[PDB]
Design a protein around this ligand. Structure first.
Ligand SMILES: *[C@@H]1O[C@H](CO)[C@@H](O[C@@H]2O[C@H](CO)[C@@H](O)[C@H](O)[C@H]2NC(C)=O)[C@H](O[C@@H]2O[C@@H](C)[C@@H](O)[C@@H](O)[C@@H]2O)[C@H]1NC(C)=O
Length: 225
């Protein structure tokens, strides 16, 4: 395995998007992962629709909150996801128009990993790095400090147990700086936020659940080449 890896430099990651005043991080983390997995498997990178997920994933709650795995499940069940162009983002709840969509990007399946008190940090870090090398993954996280972030490696700051799940980000890679390891995470708050729209999250901090609970629930779309 590489000492560092960044899918955002491999031509499989779309530009950083802006979710606005809508708690749809779950949807952006999901489209971001599908966009990457699709590009990695087919060689074609195309921006996908967060709005379709917001309006159609009945198990989630649109702009209030939702889930990455429920989005992937919905995509498998409905033959694919619409493009950003064909199903524009409205930043608010809307009527599901999936039946009116012609072109769709499909996924073969999806994976999920929910940590239990039986796992160790080493195993958590190992499995996650393993998934990331195959394709970007979505993770739930407590983004309480995100509006304070401007750059550098975020170490968890004000996060503490219990970690709330109020946001999702896309882990596209990892690296290390001066002996400090970190994940490269794509956010959906515009390119002006953080490091060109991304945030470096410290890893191997010692807590099984990771920084702000990011190790807790990973989920990703699966697509064969
Ligand atoms: C943890 O919470 C602290 C209190 O809310 C954060 O500090 C506050 O950050 C604000 C935005 O940067 C700033 O306007 C406040 O003055 C400051 N509060 C105090 C009393 O310092 C803290 O943010 C980090 O630390 C502060 C001091 C600044 O350097 C921020 O830029 C840092 O992000 C939070 N910890 C984090 C976000 O890691």
């Amino acid at each position: 395995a590489p000492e560092s890896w960044d899918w955002s430099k491999k031509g499989v990651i779309t530009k950083v998007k802006f979710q606005g005043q809508c708690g749809s991080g779950w949807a952006f983390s999901a489209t971001g992962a599908i966009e990457a997995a699709h590009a990695i498997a087919t060689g074609n990178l195309v921006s996908l629709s967060e709005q379709e997920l917001i309006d159609c994933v009945d198990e989630s709650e649109g702009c209030y909150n939702g889930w990455h795995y429920q989005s992937f499940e919905w995509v498998v069940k409905h033959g694919g996801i619409a493009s950003e162009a064909d199903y524009p983002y409205k930043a608010r709840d809307g009527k599901c128009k999936a039946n009116e969509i012609q072109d769709k990007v499909t996924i073969d399946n999806y994976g999920v990993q929910i940590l239990s008190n039986e796992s160790t940090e080493s195993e958590a870090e190992s499995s996650l790095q393993s998934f990331v090398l195959e394709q970007p993954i979505s993770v739930s996280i407590d983004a309480k400090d995100f509006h304070f972030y401007s750059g550098g490696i975020y170490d968890g700051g004000n996060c503490s147990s219990p970690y709330g799940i109020n946001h999702f980000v896309l882990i596209v890679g990892y690296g290390s700086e001066d002996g400090v390891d970190y994940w490269i995470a794509k956010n959906s708050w515009g390119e002006d936020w953080g490091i060109d729209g991304y945030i470096r999250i410290q890893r191997n901090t010692g807590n099984l659940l990771g920084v702000c609970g990011m190790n807790y629930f990973a989920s990703y779309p699966i697509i064969e080449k």
